[model samples]
Target: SGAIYVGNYRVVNRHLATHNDWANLVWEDSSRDLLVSSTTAQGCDTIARCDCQTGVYYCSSRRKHYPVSFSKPSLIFVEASEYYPARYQSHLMLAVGHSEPGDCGGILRCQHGVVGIVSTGGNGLVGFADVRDLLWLDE
Candidate 1:
């Protein structure tokens, strides 16, 4: 709805676990990041099998440019701006809008908890992988 400033932190390293469906951002603290839940019981399509009116709090970075300081050597971090409330077109797909490069790997959180992870998007809708499937993979 409006621009909100959430705390910004440097993503040390992004780790891919179990399957390629999910990735965890290693923050400043090691114990800070943890796997919450996954779609063990319900399926991907089941969670997003609602009408187009279904909305989700998609948290991601709008910073499109990643400037590399080769001369000075600095860490360019992605900032979390606001919860983009976007509608879903289908299972694991978001209605076409302003999705960008840095927008991938974002968390799709609803009232229940973490649901999906922003995967890929382009000519069509923004697609995401079900986070509930992450439980199948071990840390």
Candidate 2:
């Protein structure tokens, strides 16, 4: 298997274990006490599984898919058993020298059992706001 890249750095998963100078950190949590409602779908992918799940939303296509040679933008796709939801080799990422955490914010979300990066509560930006888990673990 080859390596994967979130931006410029290689990544194993989008479950970022991150913090800041203020000593606050953020990450994805599948164990959060969110309501779990079994859902089903047809024809389309995973029956748009997010429909049944209480806290999660279905992300369309992640951003920056074509600009870089790397592929896999973290779209929640199913493999076997249409009822079962699957996640990519999503991971959290950090940069040696990268954009400053300006007046912006961040978010980490989960779906059914899969989890990935998400938009923050305030001034938050996301590739597809429609596809994120509805419930949040931390701000």
Candidate 3:
């Protein structure tokens, strides 16, 4: 795993971790309040469910409530990955060293399939806006 420097911090590469092994990881200290809750575990695997649930919860709590819409097929396809890994990873990523500031809203695709739109990015990393959660006008 390569070391990645961001802001004032340096983070190691993303590598797979088993349930028992994750207890000793860096995020485990502050994350205990976020991780061990029972509600987050109900949706999926007994041992490995809290990260996504807590992520959604923290985003909703800290950010403004946005009207979200999802098509039925989108929901079905996203959920199917709960049973097995999806064929496509389906997220957009790019090198921060290469793209210009104006590239933030560009579309990303794989072959003919649309993947996602580029959101704000920094530190040699890019994150795709979630296609599953379409923002709708509140009016």
Candidate 4:
């Protein structure tokens, strides 16, 4: 005994054959947002900055045992130094000890176009000021 294809099978086959003529579906939508992921995906949060214009995502080191969570809403600004290359976009330094270790201390200098740990100065309580608040090229 054998099964025979008839009636609806023929119409279905014909439709399938013609289906290839349809235009290919493509998702052209674009998002100018940044996404951050962490290698250590437990009890730690990953920080990232997004360039809305370029859709580039910049990530920072994983903050462990920190009270801040990804759900917390906050904004951080990028700073640049004349002595350092433009690629090093340092974060605005606040008072030292205010932030956790590995954080850019007072005037933390960050290298643009690269992601890694940044060297800092003395560990003592260092006072910090925002770059925006300071005048440029003060004599």
Deviation in Å, model 2, residue 96 alpha carbon: 32
Estimate the overall C-alpha local distance difference test score of candidate 3. 0.27
Considering summed lDDT, which 10 consecutive residues are worst modelled in model 1? 67-76
Q: Is candidate 1 or candidate 2 better by TM-score?
A: 1
TM-score of each: 0.36, 0.17, 0.26, 0.16
Best lDDT among the predictions, by candidate number: 1
TM-score of 3: 0.26
lDDT score, residue 107, model 4?
21
C-alpha lDDT score of every prediction, in listed order:
0.35, 0.24, 0.27, 0.21
- Per-residue lDDT, model 3, residue 101, is 39
Ranking by TM-score: 1, 3, 2, 4
TM-score of 4: 0.16
Tens-digit lDDT string for candidate 3 (70-90): 111111112122223433323
Candidate 4 Cα deviation (angstroms), residue 131: 15
lDDT of 2 by residue, 10-127 (tens): 2111222223211322332332211111112221111122332123222223321111111123333323323224443232222111112221122222334322322211222222
| Predicted structure 1, TM vs. truth | 0.36
Candidate 4: where are CA atoms >4 Å away?
1-47, 50-92, 98-116, 126-139
The most accurate candidate by TM-score is 1
Indicate whether candidate 1 or candidate 4 has the larger lDDT: 1
